[PDB]
């Protein structure tokens, strides 16, 4: 029974639970890697005495946090648990293929571990650019194991995208149009379309890297007429959609959380929120070269990519202002999930504004490959994603488990994390403006003060992560079972009780046309 249920699953809730457990474990790995980064930088000099190892830690930090923590939690965990419930569907369209999307991830993560254990690791950056990642500067198996890890994670997510698009298009009640589905469901559909289109381009690029390393191709090698910059275009043609894939489900969850704890039946400006996510999805394919402003790019191309990148703040702003308009007039409930969502709005706004600074290619010349970029994305993406994940985890933990958290402990956890992440990343703006490069294991002495503060911040967030594990333990240890949940008339995922039965919507909802 245990194997049938948990290794042979065809159930969207159990698969969602598997993804949440996997993603929480990966988040411990990715946090430990981030603390090694900050320990190496927390005083001047060398800590590891091996900067190849430092570079391997940085590279694996980003792959773990992106491919094994955020994407599995947002899309595999919250998407599988919540999407079918929010449309009244009995499961996903392809419930068995869904289980393979999950089970490809432990082997993908094993390949990434393997890459770091063999030879000297892949000390490449998560961009994996050649020729550093080629077979002369990274001879041996580490980079190929990293490529294969990415291939498996890509297949997992492409099949998952197929599943989500199909389920959301085909399995709603017959009377429910796409403009009657909740915003989280929209955010997953759009994320899935971005995955479907972008991950095959990454797969092509990393396969060309694999063949340059092992089959004597020269896609990226000038000796054969190849070009390192071609790899960067293929990588970033995926990688820009990827940053929106990482945040879009978070936007969906934030819309639900802000609406719920405002005591509202609906988000402000629903169609504008759909418009904004669709626009971000579409424009997310035409801006990638802003990751390449220093490669030797012609001025008119720089001007185009600057302008297209600026156009994206418009639909993103409709979403920030619409979250503020949802709060307006609300019966505000200061629950821990609401605190996470308000933290998200603040931090995402800070990070999006420093992205606007970066969009100007002339300023980006001076800021590229410095800690100002690291500060932009740890606000707008890394901590935007983590605060939306924690808001959604706190808000929906009683649905998934049937038990309540201790809200006082959850508010203490939020307070510690908010101090920690701001102490960690805010000073990195100053480091970047004053010229400290990213991807460095040590720094000229002038940069000591802000690196020291940033590293002390990183230990505050460690304390918060340890406390989060205790908080989850205390909830399962005390077994406070949920009774009543407010606002079920506009939050269908709760209407089957906590936790919902294994099969839900065996009799579908009744929705008429009128």
């Amino acid at each position: 029974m245990f194997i049938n249920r948990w290794l042979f699953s065809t159930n969207h809730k159990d698969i969602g639970t598997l993804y949440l457990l996997f993603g929480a474990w990966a988040g411990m790995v990715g946090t430990a890697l981030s603390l090694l980064i900050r320990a190496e930088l927390g005083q001047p000099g060398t800590l590891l005495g091996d900067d190849q190892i430092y570079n391997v830690v940085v590279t694996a930090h980003a792959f773990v946090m992106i491919f094994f923590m955020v994407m599995p939690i947002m899309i595999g965990g919250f998407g599988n648990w919540l999407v079918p419930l929010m449309i009244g569907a009995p499961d996903m369209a392809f419930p068995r293929m869904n289980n393979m999307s999950f089970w490809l991830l432990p082997p993908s993560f094993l390949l990434l571990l393997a890459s770091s254990m063999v030879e000297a690791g892949a000390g490449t950056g998560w961009t994996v650019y050649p020729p550093l990642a080629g077979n002369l500067a990274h001879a041996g198996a580490s980079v190929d194991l990293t490529i294969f890890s990415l291939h498996l994670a890509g297949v997992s997510s492409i099949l998952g995208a197929i599943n989500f698009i199909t389920t959301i298009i085909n399995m709603k009640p017959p009377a429910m149009s796409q403009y009657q589905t909740p915003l989280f469901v929209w955010s997953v559909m759009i994320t899935a379309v971005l995955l479907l289109l972008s991950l095959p381009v990454l797969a092509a690029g990393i396969t060309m890297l694999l063949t340059d390393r092992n089959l004597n191709t020269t896609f990226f090698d000038p000796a054969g007429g190849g070009d390192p910059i071609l790899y960067q275009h293929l990588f970033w043609f995926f990688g820009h959609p990827e940053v929106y894939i990482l945040i879009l489900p978070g936007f969906g969850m934030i819309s639900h959380i802000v609406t719920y704890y405002s005591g509202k039946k609906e988000p402000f400006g629903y169609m504008g929120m759909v418009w904004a996510m669709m626009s971000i999805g579409f424009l997310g394919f035409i801006v990638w070269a802003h990751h390449m402003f220093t490669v030797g790019m012609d001025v008119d191309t720089r001007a185009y990519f600057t302008s297209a990148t600026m156009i994206i703040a418009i639909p993103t702003g409709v979403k920030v202002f619409s979250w503020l308009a949802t709060l307006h007039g609300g019966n505000i409930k200061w629950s821990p999930a609401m605190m996470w969502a308000l933290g998200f709005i603040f931090l995402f706004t800070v990070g999006g504004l420093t992205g606007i600074v970066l969009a100007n290619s002339s300023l980006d010349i001076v800021l590229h490959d410095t800690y100002y970029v690291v500060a932009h994305f740890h606000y707008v993406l890394s901590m935007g994603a983590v605060f939306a994940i924690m808001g959604g985890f706190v808000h929906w933990f009683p649905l998934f488990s049937g038990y309540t958290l201790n809200d006082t402990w959850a508010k203490i956890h939020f307070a510690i994390m908010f101090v920690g992440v701001n102490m960690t990343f805010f000073p990195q703006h100053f480091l970047g403006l004053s010229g400290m490069p990213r991807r460095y294991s040590d720094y000229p002495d002038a940069y000591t003060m802000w690196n020291t503060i940033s590293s002390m911040g990183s230990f505050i967030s460690l304390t918060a992560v340890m406390l989060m594990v205790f908080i989850i333990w205390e909830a399962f240890a005390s077994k406070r079972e949920v009774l009543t949940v407010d606002l079920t008339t506009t939050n269908l995922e709760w209407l089957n009780g906590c936790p919902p039965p294994y099969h839900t919507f065996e009799e579908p909802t009744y929705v008429n046309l009128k």
Binding site: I165, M278, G281, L283
Partner: protein
């Protein structure tokens, strides 16, 4: 394909109105900006009486026979050069 939308479900009138106002007319507005920024008169080039240009094998059937139909004196030289 290299898009980024979603909806499908049904493509009805509401969806096509959404596309008209949410994508098509904003695109026209942006290209109208792009265009009404690169507007302006550049410096016209030296006249050179190249024999493959300003072709005259028969007089035009209007005016003096030597001016094209949408002749612009500022930018269109005659076979003998710009007009005064």
């Amino acid at each position: 394909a290299s898009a980024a939308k979603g909806d499908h479900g049904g493509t009805g009138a509401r969806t096509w109105r959404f596309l008209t106002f949410g994508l098509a007319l904003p695109s026209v507005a942006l290209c109208t900006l792009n265009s009404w920024l690169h507007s302006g008169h550049r410096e016209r080039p030296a006249f050179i009486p190249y024999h493959h240009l300003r072709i005259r094998t028969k007089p035009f059937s209007w005016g003096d026979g030597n001016h094209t139909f949408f002749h612009n004196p500022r930018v269109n030289p005659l076979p003998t050069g710009y007009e005064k």
